[PDB]
């Protein structure tokens, strides 16, 4: 697998690329700026700037931005999490010259027309009025609120309608001018790109970007609404983090676990996270599932089996992202790797960290993170038969 080569410019912006023989490319800008860096007075600034970022910059007033990136034939894209913001373009490699200049405008020289600001406010607000339809997102934005009470990690990416309505260009300008620093930025490219050409384009454009205790609280939120047909319940404990080595032995544990829609998640933030399971079931069976889940976590903690570990190591092995997955998937990995680890971890190092995992250290790490821990519980729907906190806390351990 070709190595990911990283350079660093005056601004501090990093320019990471991983050349591949695929023909198109996914060039993106990552920024270490999310809802965790907001201070409850600008709780929707990143989301609303993510809406405003494609509505024209000085150089591209009006629909120019979308038009050109449309003409070139590039499906631009963007997203915001609690810690990272990404603006990426998938385009024919030859178009890097413009895929990069366009990205430069989007990060700097952007224009937040107040007129547009008004509309985006309405857009965000109205969607939020309906964002309630995404029960799962709701469950996961409370599994965050009740687990990180009193911290900037409880607040959602979208923010409360309140802030959305109460936001102005200057505020946005601040978030833009405060959390868009060049040392906190990665220009990532994946696919048919040359690293020297991309470095020269980053020196030509984007060389102007200015250079400048999270806690988990074992708790419970229960939103009871009996008119909903199905119930969604998420139970999590404190994830190790992004950099913690044991994350890998925890991923194998998730691969061992894999009622209904019983997914499993290991969400990681800067030295924190949520490790757990989300399941949707008919109200009458919520109790059973919650118990089954526990029994399983407990199984790994005291009774793993090399065979199953293997099953888990292999599934993890087929999850690692690679040139095969495509440019975007890879870029995305390049941007997150340079933002979180500070380097791109190659797949050989991932394979080494997977093959060093055995059953004994898996049950040791699972006992470190699951056994006798206070979970965060978030339920939405007909959740009366969902057990309260003593029964779940008692199910977090075995007498035997």
């Amino acid at each position: 697998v070709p190595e990911t080569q990283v350079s660093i410019l005056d601004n501090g912006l990093r320019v990471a690329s991983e050349q591949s023989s695929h023909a198109t490319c996914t060039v993106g800008v990552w920024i270490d700026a999310g809802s965790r860096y907001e201070t409850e007075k600008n709780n929707g600034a990143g989301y609303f700037l993510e809406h405003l970022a494609f509505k024209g910059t000085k150089n591209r007033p009006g629909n120019a931005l979308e038009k050109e990136v449309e003409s070139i034939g590039a499906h631009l894209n963007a997203y915001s999490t609690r810690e990272h913001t990404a603006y990426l373009i998938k385009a024919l490699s030859k178009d890097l010259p413009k895929v990069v200049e366009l990205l430069a405008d989007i990060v700097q020289n952007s224009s937040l027309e107040d007129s547009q600001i008004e509309k985006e406010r309405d857009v965000i607000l109205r969607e939020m009025q309906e964002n309630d339809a995404s029960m799962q997102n709701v469950v996961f934005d409370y599994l965050h609120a009740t687990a990180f009470q009193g911290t900037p990690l409880a607040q959602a990416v979208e923010g409360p309608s309140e802030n959305v309505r109460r936001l102005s260009r200057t505020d946005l300008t601040d978030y833009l001018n405060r959390h868009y620093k060049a040392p906190r930025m990665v220009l990532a490219a994946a696919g048919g790109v040359e690293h020297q050409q991309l470095l020269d384009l980053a020196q030509k454009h984007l060389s102007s970007v200015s250079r400048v205790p999270c806690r988990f609280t074992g708790s419970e939120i229960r939103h009871r609404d009996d008119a909903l047909p199905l119930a969604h319940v998420a139970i999590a404990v404190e994830g190790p983090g992004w950099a913690n080595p044991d994350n890998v032995t925890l991923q194998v544990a998730n691969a061992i676990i894999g009622c209904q829609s019983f997914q499993t998640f290991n969400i990681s933030y800067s030295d924190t996270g949520l490790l757990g399971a989300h399941f949707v079931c008919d109200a009458m069976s919520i109790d059973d599932m919650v118990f089954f889940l526990q029994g399983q976590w407990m199984r790994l903690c005291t009774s793993a089996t090399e065979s199953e570990v293997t099953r888990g190591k292999n599934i993890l092995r087929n999850a690692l992202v690679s040139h095969l997955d495509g440019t975007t998937p890879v870029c995305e990995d390049i941007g997150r790797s340079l933002l979180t680890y500070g380097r791109r971890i190659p797949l050989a190092e991932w394979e080494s960290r997977i093959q060093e995992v055995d059953a004994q250290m898996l049950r040791d790490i699972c006992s470190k993170y699951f056994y006798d821990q206070c979970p965060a519980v978030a339920g939405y729907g007909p959740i009366e038969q969902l057990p309260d906190y003593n029964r779940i806390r008692s199910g977090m351990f075995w007498l035997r």
Binding site: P387, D388, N390, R391, S394
Partner: protein, 189 residues
């Protein structure tokens, strides 16, 4: 009969001190209320062992430590305390039969109690006049417990006669009339 008592209750669930439908707020019992029953068991054992190990004869009668003599009858015969309320009633009614019947009714009046409920509110948490009548009922139950102890002579007898009259009149007459008045005060009747 206690197993039948528990069954006839689970069909309906326990009541709450507000007297309202508690279906919106119910919790488990094992992890939540058991530690409460265990604590109550511990406190009851504390009172039982301080009754046994420190004052083993404050509730019994000394004359029970003599052997049974049919030729002598202890001059002061009193049934044990918890039978006293009944004892008072029996002594109060002049007629022997009357006493026996009233005595029985004393216990039975309770069974008769679910047919005397004339209020639209189940509990007495929001019913102050019937609360006053209830505490007057507890008061003259304590009075009847005391009278039983007292010997037959003035004025213990009259109190006994009144206390019994007041007991039956509060349970039979005063509480449903008070519940009607309380329903009238809330613009319900």
């Amino acid at each position: 009969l206690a197993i039948v008592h528990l069954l006839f209750l689970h069909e309906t669930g326990s009541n709450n001190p507000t007297g309202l439908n508690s279906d919106a707020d119910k919790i488990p019992f094992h992890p939540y209320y058991t530690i409460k029953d265990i604590l109550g068991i511990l406190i009851m054992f504390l009172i039982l062992m301080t009754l046994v190990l420190f004052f083993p004869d404050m509730l019994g009668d000394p004359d029970n430590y003599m052997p049974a003599n049919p030729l002598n009858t202890p001059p002061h015969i009193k049934p044990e305390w918890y039978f006293l309320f009944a004892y008072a009633i029996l002594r109060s009614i002049p007629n022997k039969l009357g006493g026996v019947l009233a005595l029985i009714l004393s216990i039975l009046i309770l069974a008769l109690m679910p047919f005397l409920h004339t209020s639209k509110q189940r509990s007495l948490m929001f019913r102050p006049i019937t609360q006053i009548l209830y505490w007057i009922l507890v008061a003259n139950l304590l009075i009847l417990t005391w009278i039983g102890g007292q010997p037959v002579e003035h004025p213990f007898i009259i109190i006994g006669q009144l206390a019994s009259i007041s007991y039956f009149s509060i349970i039979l007459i005063l509480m449903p009339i008070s519940g009607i008045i309380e329903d009238k005060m809330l613009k319900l009747y």
